[PDB]
């Protein structure tokens, strides 16, 4: 869960390499996108859509191993100064109608780095953020320019727990390089139901192991030597995906002059083809 | 037909030169280095000997006449001083004889400042004697902050003469 | 994020003809021989 990254790598959500820390536990890859305007004027509330796609259909094995639905999560890194718009600056449907969850700062202060703790279902394959751009005028520590924005979107349960242990939402390979003879898949009782195993590999050391509930089995007795590999299934159906982008904090001031200049240029050119070429009659006389 | 009026181009080349200056303006501005605004000097503790400088250190040996330089003012080098009763000497002169570029030398003898490079003479509080010494040396304040002494970016007035400051 | 250049590209091509056009059109309203 997003809350997990915060507690695990509290200082920053992304490794020096650029890969976000989610991939440590959600080792399955799937798409991810960040949609922000090329540029926004300073102090403007605008949209930022974090798409975490995947066709509603298909179920993942839940803790109990029964097929269930999909829940989404993410981590968004806006550039310095940006932070969500104050509840009152968020237009009606415009920004307020689209997406409504809770954006928790990775750590006290960082209002430009939000975890989307809330883990919506098939309702939020979209997830919209109403962010407010900084003002380099009221903040001399903020400047205009093009800056980077990062994303780490998720969906589907993790294959590893912050506890260090793995979920049943992945594979439990074998312990020995050898042929198993049976499936010790009995139930249990009450608040639990394991599906043990009876590996052989009798070759000197005749070992067996334990597989949890949820992941299906494929092969067993008669063969399945391998080398303590592939249990017999990987119910993993979802994963992490990143996407980066950039937005320009534009100074309408910069634009004016560049538009002003452009007009002087076009104008300055007009006079050229006008006077120069078109007033070529002189020798055009002889 | 009766053309013969390329007397308009005093407009084609008029607006052209127009574009030229427009594009040249920022390039010229670019070359005019950045200035200050709030006026303050961000220090890389530099010693008159080349290593890290701390308060109690240079602030303790001030006997009758201590004048050694530390990481000083935007060009103007800062002297560390104390009076006889050894109180935070309310003046620390930037040996700044804006004369011909050298650092004003204090006097181990006069306790004044007699510049050798080109003959500028000064006193105990930066007070020039005559000349080639241009004018009276710039003064400072007297304070410390956690083994890291604190003097402030000057743009302010001086009491040695009484009028608004010249060495801002 | 391709659609940002996809439209960015169409513009370079077309504009050429738009400019070309006004050029032709310009000459035409003054004499193109």
């Amino acid at each position: 869960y997003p809350f997990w990254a915060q507690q695990t790598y509290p200082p920053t959500p992304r490794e020096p390499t650029g890969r976000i820390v989610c991939a440590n536990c959600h080792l399955a890859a799937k798409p991810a996108e960040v949609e922000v305007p090329q540029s926004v004027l300073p102090d403007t509330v605008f949209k930022a859509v974090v798409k975490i796609p995947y066709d509603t259909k298909l179920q993942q094995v839940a803790a109990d191993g029964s097929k269930v639905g999909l829940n989404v999560g993410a981590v968004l890194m806006l550039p310095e100064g940006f932070k969500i718009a104050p509840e009152e600056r968020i237009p009606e449907e415009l920004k307020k109608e689209v997406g409504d969850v809770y954006f928790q700062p990775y750590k006290e202060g960082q209002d430009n780095v939000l975890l989307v703790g809330p883990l919506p279902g098939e309702q939020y394959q979209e997830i919209v953020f109403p962010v407010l751009s900084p003002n380099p005028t009221t903040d001399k520590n903020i400047h205009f320019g093009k800056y980077a924005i990062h994303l780490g979107a998720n969906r589907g349960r993790g294959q590893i727990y912050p506890t260090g242990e793995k979920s049943n939402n992945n594979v439990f390979t074998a312990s020995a390089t050898g042929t198993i003879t049976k499936i010790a898949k009995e139930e249990d009782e009450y608040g639990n139901v394991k599906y043990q195993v009876s590996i052989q590999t009798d070759s000197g050391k005749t070992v067996v192991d334990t597989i949890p509930a949820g992941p299906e089995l494929i092969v067993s007795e008669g063969q399945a030597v391998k080398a303590g590999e592939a249990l017999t299934n990987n119910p993993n159906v979802g994963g992490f995906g990143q996407d980066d982008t950039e937005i320009v904090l534009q100074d309408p001031n910069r634009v004016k002059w560049m538009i002003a200049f452009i007009c002087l240029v076009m104008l300055a050119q007009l006079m050229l083809i006008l006077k120069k070429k078109q007033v070529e009659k002189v020798q055009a006389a002889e | 037909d009766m053309g013969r009026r390329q007397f308009m181009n005093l407009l084609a080349f008029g607006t052209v030169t127009g574009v030229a200056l427009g594009a040249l303006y920022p390039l010229v501005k670019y070359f005019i280095p950045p200035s200050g605004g709030a006026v303050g000097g961000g220090t890389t503790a530099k010693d008159k000997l080349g290593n890290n400088v701390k308060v109690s250190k240079f602030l303790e040996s001030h006997n009758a006449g201590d004048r050694v330089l530390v990481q000083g003012l935007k060009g103007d080098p800062t002297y560390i001083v104390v009076e006889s009763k050894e109180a935070i000497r309310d003046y620390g002169i930037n040996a700044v004889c804006t004369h011909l570029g050298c650092v004003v030398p204090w006097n181990a003898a006069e306790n004044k400042f007699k510049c050798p490079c080109h003959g500028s003479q000064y006193d105990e509080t930066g007070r020039v004697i005559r000349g080639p010494a241009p004018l009276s040396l710039a003064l400072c304040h007297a304070t410390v902050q956690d083994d890291n002494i604190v003097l402030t970016p000057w743009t302010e007035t001086d009491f040695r003469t009484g009028e608004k400051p010249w060495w801002v | 994020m391709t659609e940002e250049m996809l439209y960015a590209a169409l513009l370079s091509f077309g504009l050429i003809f738009v400019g070309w056009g006004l050029g032709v059109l310009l000459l035409k309203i003054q004499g193109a021989e």
């Binding site: 007009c263 076009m266 104008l267 007009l270 006008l274 078109q278 | 308009m8 | 006004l22 310009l26 309203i29």
Partner: peptide, 27 residues
């Protein structure tokens, strides 16, 4: 959208000036 709703604009303006500054000195 305002590529035309606007270029169509900015463009014809400097153009009018063009076709007109012609007449102006064409006379």
């Amino acid at each position: 959208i305002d590529v035309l709703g606007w270029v169509a604009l900015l463009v014809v303006f400097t153009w009018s000036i063009a076709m007109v500054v012609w007449g102006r000195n064409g006379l």
